[PDB]
Amino acid sequence: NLVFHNKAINGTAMKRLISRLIDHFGMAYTSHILDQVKTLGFQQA
Amino acid sequence: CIKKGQILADGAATVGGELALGKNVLVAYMPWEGYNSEDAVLISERLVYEDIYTSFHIRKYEI
Amino acid sequence: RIPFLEEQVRKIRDGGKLLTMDIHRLLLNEDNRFDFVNEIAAEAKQYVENNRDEYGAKKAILHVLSNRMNDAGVYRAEAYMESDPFKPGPGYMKDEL
In whole angstroms, what is the distance from residue A20 CA to residue C9 CA?
24
What Rg do the C-alpha atoms of chain A give, in angstroms? 11
CA distance C21 to C40: 16
Q: What is the largest CA-CA distance in chain A?
A: 28
Residues 6+ apart with CB under 8 A from A27: C24
Angle between helix C33-50 and C17-27 (nearest 10): 120
Contact (CB, 8 A) for C61 and C40: yes
Question: Within 10 Å of residue C60's Cβ, how many Cβ atoms?
Answer: 22
Q: Where are the alpha helices (DSSP H) in A1-45?
A: 11-24, 26-44
CA distance A33 to A14: 12
Q: Which residue of C has its CA nearest to A36?
A: C8
* Backbone dihedral region for residue B7 (phi beyond 0: left; psi -120 to 50: alpha; all else: beta): beta
Separation of CA B18 from chain center: 14
Q: How many angstroms separate the CA atoms of B41 and B32, rounded?
A: 9
Integer-rounded Cα radius of gyration of chain B: 19
Question: At how many Å resolution was this determined?
Answer: 2.8
Give CA angle at C62 (C56, C68), nearest 5°: 140
- Which stretch of DSSP H or E encloses residue C62? helix C60-70
Residue type at position C36: F
- Minimum distance, in Å, between the CA of residue A6 and any CA atom of chain B: 25
How many beta carbons lie within 10 A of that of residue A30, not counting itself? 19
Query: From CA A33, how far away is CA A35, in angstroms rounded?
Result: 5
Contact list in C for residue A28 (CB cut-off 8 A) is 20-21, 24
d(CA A9, CA A26): 22
Long-range Cβ contact pairs of C77-83 (< 8 A, separation 24 or more): C80/C16, C80/C18, C80/C19, C81/C57, C82/C14
Q: Which residues of A touch B40 (CB under 8 A)?
A: none
SS3 C89: coil
